[PDB]
Design an enzyme around this catalytic site. Structure first.
Site, PDB file in Angstrom:
ATOM      1  N   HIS A  63     -37.566  17.390  34.827  1.00 26.94           N
ATOM      2  CA  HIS A  63     -36.456  17.959  34.075  1.00 26.94           C
ATOM      3  C   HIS A  63     -35.347  18.437  35.017  1.00 26.94           C
ATOM      4  O   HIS A  63     -34.166  18.385  34.680  1.00 26.94           O
ATOM      5  CB  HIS A  63     -36.864  19.164  33.221  1.00 26.94           C
ATOM      6  CG  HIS A  63     -38.074  18.975  32.385  1.00 26.94           C
ATOM      7  ND1 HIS A  63     -38.116  18.034  31.365  1.00 26.94           N
ATOM      8  CD2 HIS A  63     -39.263  19.612  32.367  1.00 26.94           C
ATOM      9  CE1 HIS A  63     -39.289  18.133  30.733  1.00 26.94           C
ATOM     10  NE2 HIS A  63     -40.000  19.066  31.326  1.00 26.94           N
ATOM     11  N   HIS A  91     -32.772  26.565  40.026  1.00 26.94           N
ATOM     12  CA  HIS A  91     -32.661  25.153  39.730  1.00 26.94           C
ATOM     13  C   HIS A  91     -31.221  24.901  39.277  1.00 26.94           C
ATOM     14  O   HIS A  91     -30.464  25.842  39.066  1.00 26.94           O
ATOM     15  CB  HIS A  91     -33.690  24.733  38.658  1.00 26.94           C
ATOM     16  CG  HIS A  91     -33.382  25.397  37.349  1.00 26.94           C
ATOM     17  ND1 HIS A  91     -33.920  26.622  36.999  1.00 26.94           N
ATOM     18  CD2 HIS A  91     -32.536  25.059  36.339  1.00 26.94           C
ATOM     19  CE1 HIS A  91     -33.417  26.986  35.817  1.00 26.94           C
ATOM     20  NE2 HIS A  91     -32.579  26.052  35.420  1.00 26.94           N
ATOM     21  N   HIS A  93     -28.454  22.153  36.862  1.00 27.63           N
ATOM     22  CA  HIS A  93     -28.155  21.134  35.865  1.00 27.63           C
ATOM     23  C   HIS A  93     -26.902  20.397  36.336  1.00 27.63           C
ATOM     24  O   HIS A  93     -25.967  21.023  36.857  1.00 27.63           O
ATOM     25  CB  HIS A  93     -27.864  21.802  34.519  1.00 27.63           C
ATOM     26  CG  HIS A  93     -28.988  22.619  34.051  1.00 27.63           C
ATOM     27  ND1 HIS A  93     -29.981  22.177  33.197  1.00 27.63           N
ATOM     28  CD2 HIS A  93     -29.283  23.884  34.369  1.00 27.63           C
ATOM     29  CE1 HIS A  93     -30.848  23.171  33.018  1.00 27.63           C
ATOM     30  NE2 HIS A  93     -30.462  24.207  33.749  1.00 27.63           N
ATOM     31  N   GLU A 103     -23.783  23.509  31.983  1.00 23.97           N
ATOM     32  CA  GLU A 103     -24.283  23.860  30.671  1.00 23.97           C
ATOM     33  C   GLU A 103     -23.287  24.772  29.944  1.00 23.97           C
ATOM     34  O   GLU A 103     -22.824  24.438  28.851  1.00 23.97           O
ATOM     35  CB  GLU A 103     -25.650  24.521  30.831  1.00 23.97           C
ATOM     36  CG  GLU A 103     -26.692  23.587  31.426  1.00 23.97           C
ATOM     37  CD  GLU A 103     -28.079  23.808  30.869  1.00 23.97           C
ATOM     38  OE1 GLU A 103     -28.627  24.938  31.117  1.00 23.97           O
ATOM     39  OE2 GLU A 103     -28.584  22.947  30.100  1.00 23.97           O
ATOM     40  N   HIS A 116     -28.812  27.993  38.279  1.00 25.01           N
ATOM     41  CA  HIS A 116     -29.466  29.069  37.543  1.00 25.01           C
ATOM     42  C   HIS A 116     -30.475  29.763  38.439  1.00 25.01           C
ATOM     43  O   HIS A 116     -31.453  29.141  38.822  1.00 25.01           O
ATOM     44  CB  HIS A 116     -30.190  28.495  36.305  1.00 25.01           C
ATOM     45  CG  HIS A 116     -29.241  28.060  35.223  1.00 25.01           C
ATOM     46  ND1 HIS A 116     -29.560  27.189  34.196  1.00 25.01           N
ATOM     47  CD2 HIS A 116     -27.910  28.365  35.049  1.00 25.01           C
ATOM     48  CE1 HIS A 116     -28.480  26.963  33.463  1.00 25.01           C
ATOM     49  NE2 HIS A 116     -27.477  27.721  33.919  1.00 25.01           N
ATOM     50  N   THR A 195     -32.349  27.596  28.261  1.00 23.37           N
ATOM     51  CA  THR A 195     -31.585  26.421  27.825  1.00 23.37           C
ATOM     52  C   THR A 195     -32.497  25.196  27.771  1.00 23.37           C
ATOM     53  O   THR A 195     -32.007  24.090  27.494  1.00 23.37           O
ATOM     54  CB  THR A 195     -30.386  26.099  28.706  1.00 23.37           C
ATOM     55  OG1 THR A 195     -30.837  25.610  29.983  1.00 23.37           O
ATOM     56  CG2 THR A 195     -29.411  27.243  28.863  1.00 23.37           C
TER      57      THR A 195
HETATM   58  C1  LIG Z   1     -40.010  29.043  34.403  1.00 23.37           C
HETATM   59  C2  LIG Z   1     -38.550  29.059  34.058  1.00 23.37           C
HETATM   60  O1  LIG Z   1     -37.717  29.655  34.718  1.00 23.37           O
HETATM   61  N1  LIG Z   1     -38.201  28.305  32.981  1.00 23.37           N
HETATM   62  C3  LIG Z   1     -36.907  28.136  32.575  1.00 23.37           C
HETATM   63  N2  LIG Z   1     -36.586  27.340  31.578  1.00 23.37           N
HETATM   64  N3  LIG Z   1     -35.211  27.306  31.341  1.00 23.37           N
HETATM   65  C4  LIG Z   1     -34.543  28.028  32.173  1.00 23.37           C
HETATM   66  S1  LIG Z   1     -32.809  28.188  32.164  1.00 23.37           S
HETATM   67  N4  LIG Z   1     -32.225  26.739  32.147  1.00 23.37           N
HETATM   68  O2  LIG Z   1     -32.474  28.844  30.931  1.00 23.37           O
HETATM   69  O3  LIG Z   1     -32.450  28.784  33.427  1.00 23.37           O
HETATM   70  S2  LIG Z   1     -35.546  28.840  33.297  1.00 23.37           S
HETATM   71 ZN   LIG Z   2     -31.320  26.164  33.823  1.00 22.57          ZN
HETATM   72 ZN   LIG Z   3     -41.831  19.717  30.745  1.00 29.64          ZN
END
Ligand SMILES: CC(=O)Nc1nnc(S(N)(=O)=O)s1
Ligand SMILES: [Zn+2]
Ligand SMILES: [Zn+2]
Length: 257
Positions: A63, A91, A93, A103, A116, A195
């Site tokens: 992802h 991480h 996007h 996003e 993020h 998200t």
């Molecule tokens: C383990 C963890 O952090 N999971 C998340 N899933 N979505 C996220 S977000 N895009 O809202 O930063 S973080």
């Molecule tokens: Zn994120």
């Molecule tokens: Zn998954």
């Protein structure tokens, strides 16, 4: 697999079938309208207390790629938050060569990518308890635009070849997330959600006004990652963003006039 993703058959328009909160009242991301996101004086300056982490892990979960913090340190306090929030991972996007891939948007404008930094409220003892609460998580979002290289991103980009496919992970050592921040900590804030599934409404969003600049060569490395697992047909990891979601009853607040 019919595991969620970002494709035609498993993407954001499908997510509500397994995760009904996808149609909730506090979903993220959103568009940030500069004319209606009002300055709030109850808001404090942000306190971002980061330093070099020793033991980390970098991984491709199909992802995005995560950089995870394993030291038993880096914390976020202040701004709209009550208490102390501990950094667990970060991480990105991003889009394709042909498109923008943030996003959040600002006055309907998308940035090239979005970082993020995910933090959980230390009051709760662990991450799993935190995600179940409205005050559980704080995500610091930072826009990326394409310009000159971000030196503090280079160590991340340099190891992406080693986690090309879904399921790959690697030891990653000696990384300081201070190198990912812009100069200004001016921000917008609102209550929202993860998200991605499980899309829980447990997040205080803090989105920085000032983007960071990264080089085309840096973001190119993001785009060479794969959604697929090793040995399967190549599906480049691009456009791993969710569309903007209705604000409903919420107000977005600004830390700055
Ligand atoms: C383990 C963890 O952090 N999971 C998340 N899933 N979505 C996220 S977000 N895009 O809202 O930063 S973080
Ligand atoms: Zn994120
Ligand atoms: Zn998954």
């Amino acid at each position: 697999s019919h595991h969620w993703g970002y494709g035609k058959h498993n993407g954001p328009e499908h997510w509500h079938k397994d995760f009904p909160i996808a149609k909730g009242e506090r979903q993220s991301p959103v568009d940030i309208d500069t004319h209606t996101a009002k300055y709030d004086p109850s808001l404090k300056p942000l306190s971002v207390s980061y330093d070099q982490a020793t033991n980390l892990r970098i991984l491709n979960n199909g992802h995005a790629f995560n950089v995870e913090f394993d030291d038993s340190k880096a914390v976020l306090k202040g701004g709209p938050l009550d208490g102390t929030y501990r950094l667990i991972q970060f991480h990105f996007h991003w889009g394709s060569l042909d498109g923008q891939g943030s996003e959040h948007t600002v006055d309907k404008k998308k940035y090239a990518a979005e970082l993020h930094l995910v933090h959980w409220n230390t009051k709760y003892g662990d991450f799993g308890k935190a995600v179940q609460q409205p005050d559980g998580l704080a995500v610091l979002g930072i826009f990326l635009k394409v310009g000159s290289a971000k030196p503090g991103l280079q160590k991340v980009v340099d190891v992406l070849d080693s986690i090309k496919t879904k399921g790959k992970s690697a030891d990653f050592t000696n990384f300081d997330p201070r190198g990912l921040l812009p100069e200004s900590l001016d921000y917008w804030t609102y209550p929202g959600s993860l998200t991605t599934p499980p899309l829980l409404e447990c997040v205080t969003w803090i989105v920085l006004k000032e983007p960071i600049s990264v080089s085309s060569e840096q973001v190119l490395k993001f785009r060479k990652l794969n959604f697929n697992g090793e040995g399967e047909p190549e599906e480049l990891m691009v456009d791993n963003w969710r569309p903007a979601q209705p604000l409903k009853n919420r107000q977005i607040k600004a830390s700055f006039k």
